[PDB]
Design a protein around this ligand. Structure first.
Ligand SMILES: C[S@@+](CC[C@H](N)C(=O)[O-])C[C@H]1O[C@@H](n2cnc3c(N)ncnc32)[C@H](O)[C@@H]1O
Ligand SMILES: C[S@@+](CC[C@H](N)C(=O)[O-])C[C@H]1O[C@@H](n2cnc3c(N)ncnc32)[C@H](O)[C@@H]1O
Ligand code: SF4
Ligand code: SF4
Lengths: 294, 316
């Protein structure tokens, strides 16, 4: 893709250029900056912060350069001077493509979204929202709002999320039939532990696509409506170290919902999704359990 | 303390209040928020990021609240709605001063300290003069507000006419910097242990000499800039990138908030130049996986500064 970047800089005669990478790709940062500074007149600034997705735009860097190039993710939101360099996986998914139903849904991650159209020939792909048909995220299952499901990729969080959010069967094909019962007992365990919690830290992230302050204020009032207390804690990164310093009984995460699931055993008090918080408080019934979405 | 905060909230009729603590005081955050929300009508938001000092204001939070209370440090900069609740310690420092008087060899003495003892420096100065000596307290600047106050990144209070210094406080980084910055003898007097020692910059400079040597064969540098409110040095970084190119090397500017070993390891640079908090360079040296240099040590490595022309990295 490096030639589109060079052409975009020259054609826009960019003078200052920002680069932002997911963790998996910062190993390439210095080489890409080298190519740009050698083959253009632009000066490069690399973002040095962790970056977890298109929900995590370095907007400070973006407001300092003519164009910020953000790698590894499909776009999100609308910032005038951020270009998303997608970076797709070249692997073949047709080997991976147990079913029972006649209408079968395709869902995947951004790295394979270009390959759905022909996996479909081998069926209705689900259109998303503000990106691609069939794309799901840890925080967004719109593409699954379309009888059974085949997910394409690695990891089990995405198929689980689809299975919980639509209550349909999902086959997970890496390039496995997904059981959400193991995940729901787990989340049940955290709800039980937090049932006797009296004081809650309500986590809000300033990251560009993870900020949910209005929901946090709602959650604070719902806690007080039920004779408990939540204090809003505003931060950038959400980490077990930073939550240990505040002496709360339990936490409610309104930032990235995969923090809540992935890094669960790593936190030293219970960390809850908004919806599990409501169940702990008595505002929502356990049967009305849903995936945290943004 | 808490009475000042409550009064300020009621005098200024605040509805949204922010709290920011250094790491040692986040343990009190919830208790202080509770007190505020029970005794006022205000809603509290607590900053959850690391906070390293008054150089590290949570300006996103401050731009979201009527007033941000920032704890533990003396003020710095000029932020319209930030109130600094400083960390003042009540330990008697005069016994440490007396111990340090044993060690002096000159009659004209400078006094410096950290923020938690600046209110007692005038009393120390009186005792030192009562014991036959001349004594002076240097004025700070817009960064080190109080007379006699030094920071890891600011030794202006030490730029005074005196023969030797007494530093009052714990740790040895501050008197080391004063010793290196002034070329004068420094006695470090710790009021909590009541001991005085003569600081020696030799082990310090031998250590810094070791990192310059490792970075001397470096071809590619990451030049680190922090977006923190009082640590941002982009113009300097742009200068150092040009200076590297002038000398047949390459520096790439890397803009970040926290500067940590994990973040520096993700980039394939041979070495780094840190224009953020100078104490990162010193304290965390052994933890980084490539050499990290001060701006001035960078100039040595490149050929812009004699290797003995060694100065402390200061924020100014
Ligand atoms: C690795 S990304 C997942 C990839 C992709 N974003 C997706 O939609 O599935 C999710 C991980 O990023 C990290 N993460 C996301 N937002 C974070 C935040 N605000 N603070 C700290 N870690 C965060 C968490 O460790 C979480 O497990
Ligand atoms: C302990 S505080 C210093 C307290 C006081 N401000 C002073 O003048 O001495 C300095 C430490 O904070 C950490 N620190 C400061 N700024 C930082 C930054 N931008 N990123 C990561 N760590 C930082 C470094 O580890 C450094 O050792
Ligand atoms: S799952 Fe988390 S990291 Fe991925 S897009 Fe959603 S908020 Fe960002
Ligand atoms: S030494 Fe570092 S942490 Fe202390 S005031 Fe200076 S920049 Fe901030």
């Amino acid at each position: 893709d490096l030639e589109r970047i060079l052409k975009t800089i020259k054609d826009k005669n960019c003078k200052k250029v920002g680069l932002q990478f997911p963790e998996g790709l910062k190993r390439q940062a210095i080489n890409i900056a080298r190519e740009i500074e050698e083959k253009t007149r632009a000066n490069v600034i690399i973002s040095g912060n962790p970056c977890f997705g298109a929900c995590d735009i370095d907007t400070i860097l973006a407001g300092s350069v003519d164009i910020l190039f953000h790698f590894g993710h499909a776009g999100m939101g609308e910032y005038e001077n951020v270009v998303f360099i997608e970076a797709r996986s070249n692997i073949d998914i047709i080997p991976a493509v147990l079913l029972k139903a006649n209408r079968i849904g395709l869902i995947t991650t951004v790295q394979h979204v270009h390959k759905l159209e022909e996996a479909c020939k081998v069926c209705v792909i689900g259109k998303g929202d503000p990106i691609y048909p069939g794309q799901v995220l840890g925080c967004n299952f719109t593409a699954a709002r379309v009888e059974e499901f085949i997910y394409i990729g690695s990891g089990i969080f995405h198929p689980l999320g689809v299975a919980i959010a639509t209550k349909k069967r999902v086959i997970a094909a890496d390039p496995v039939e997904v059981s959400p019962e193991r995940f729901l007992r787990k989340r049940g365990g955290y709800i039980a532990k937090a049932t006797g919690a009296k004081i809650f830290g309500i986590i809000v992230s300033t990251k560009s696509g993870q900020y949910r302050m209005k929901l946090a204020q709602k959650l604070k009032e719902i806690a007080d409506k039920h004779g408990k207390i939540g204090y809003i804690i505003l931060m950038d990164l959400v980490t077990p170290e930073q939550l240990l310093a505040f002496k709360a009984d339990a936490y409610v995460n309104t930032a990235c919902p995969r923090i809540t699931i992935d890094d669960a055993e790593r936190f030293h008090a219970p960390v809850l999704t908004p919806q599990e918080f409501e169940i702990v408080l008595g505002e929502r019934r356990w049967e009305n359990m849903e995936m945290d979405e943004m």
